[PDB]
Symmetry: C3
């Protein structure tokens, strides 16, 4: 699976180990090995949430399955929790879009996962 | 709703007030309260459109509903008009990807909108 | 169609001509004219793939049609370009493929519908 966070929080506010923590936490939450988790953190962004430039984050979690009503609620609590604790971003200034990818539509290593 | 613009136009060419204008105009076009509108502008990008590095934009609008044939035509007219007016990007060097999100697949404030 | 590459490789390692080569190769692979191909390369990113930060890329290809099982295999072989030009191992590349409906792609004050 793939997790991306775009935030207006400065690069210096992202703690050392944040990518490793996201990797480990997402591996645990999705039930998939850390070797298949990619994480991408994009600080210093020009963004606004509800017209306000207070700390916010726009995120996506893409996975082949393990996406659904209850799972996404659990992912949102986990990820908002981490963004609040590590980046000091309020959960109500975070969006996370969830994408259930078909294996045929994820490329990797010269082929796809189909 | 969430609106992202990626462009090769320089940061200095993005006028003061641009995020706010996007926020206001998207609230009105989508019929959603401005507090739910998130906007993200990414200047200085390395990109080409039709092989040319003249000014261009690659954009996305994600929304829970309010996405459809006629609505998307109306959004493109608004958003291309704003990019042309404010960033001097010709409308024919703009792509906007529209995504109708299921409420269960948008996380916010420790939960989802389902 | 639209192709985006996000990578931790530095800007200085993206060779001259890369956006053009992507444009040309994607026009040929998708069967669509180069005038309708947009490319976006984002270097110097803070990324981990599988827990580590050796060169990697997270990519996407959005097209109105020309997306499917066999086509996507073929796109993946073509694009995993990234090895030759950016020295990224194919096993540290993900490419997300998106078959867009024409009504859901805006361009020139309207849509492709
Ligand atoms: O869920 C998976 O098994 C899996 C494994 C590797 C990559 C991905 C993935 C990459 N982009 N979107 C999903 C998913
Ligand atoms: O496949 C196409 O014909 C086509 C032409 C122009 C733009 C796009 C496109 C832009 N974003 N996602 C797809 C597709």
């Amino acid at each position: 699976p793939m997790f991306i966070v775009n935030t207006n929080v400065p690069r210096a506010s992202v703690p050392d180990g944040f990518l490793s923590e996201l990797t480990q936490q997402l591996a645990q939450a999705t039930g998939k090995p850390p070797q298949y988790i990619a994480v991408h953190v994009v600080p210093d962004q020009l963004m606004a949430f509800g017209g306000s430039s207070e700390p916010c984050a726009l995120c996506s979690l893409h996975s082949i399955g393990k996406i659904g009503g209850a799972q996404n609620r659990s992912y949102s609590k986990l990820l908002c929790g981490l963004l609040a604790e590590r980046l000091r971003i309020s959960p109500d200034r975070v969006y996370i879009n969830y994408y259930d990818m078909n294996a045929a539509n994820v490329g990797w290593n010269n082929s796809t996962f189909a």
